[PDB]
Homo-oligomer: A and B are copies of this chain.
Amino acid sequence: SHCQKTSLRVNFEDIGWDSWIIAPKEYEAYECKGGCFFPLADDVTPTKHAIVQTLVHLKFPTKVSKACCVPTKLSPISVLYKDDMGVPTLKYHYEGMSVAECGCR
């Protein structure tokens, strides 16, 4: 019930990227889901601002929003993409594609 990494399988044609991504068809991107509320967990790595804003949200729930559970570290995947000549080319480390860690920010 707190900020944590959970599964998210993404299909590239569902998001309109199949026009340039030949392969893979789908990959595990994960997502960060869960609440940022007190008491927090031991491993969500909360920033001081995320802690402060969550406290302000308690006192003023209609004015200030709470902190958000988001990726704090991302990992690459490899993709096979068509280049300007229609030739399948490998992008070995397409960065920023999969969640490695989540946290409250």
Contact = CB atoms under 8 A, between A and B. Distances in A.
Interface of A: 8, 10, 14-16, 29, 31, 33, 47-50, 52-53, 55-56, 59, 64-65, 67-71, 74, 94-99, 105
Q: How many copies does the complex hold?
A: 2
Given A14-B56, A31-B64, A105-B105, A71 B49 contact: yes
Main secondary structure of the interface of A (DSSP, over half): mixed
A105 to B, nearest CB: 4
19 contacts: A10-B52, A14-B56, A15-B52, A15-B55, A15-B59, A29-B52, A31-B53, A31-B64, A33-B65, A48-B74, A48-B97, A49-B71, A49-B97, A49-B99, A50-B71, A68-B68, A68-B70, A70-B70, A70-B105
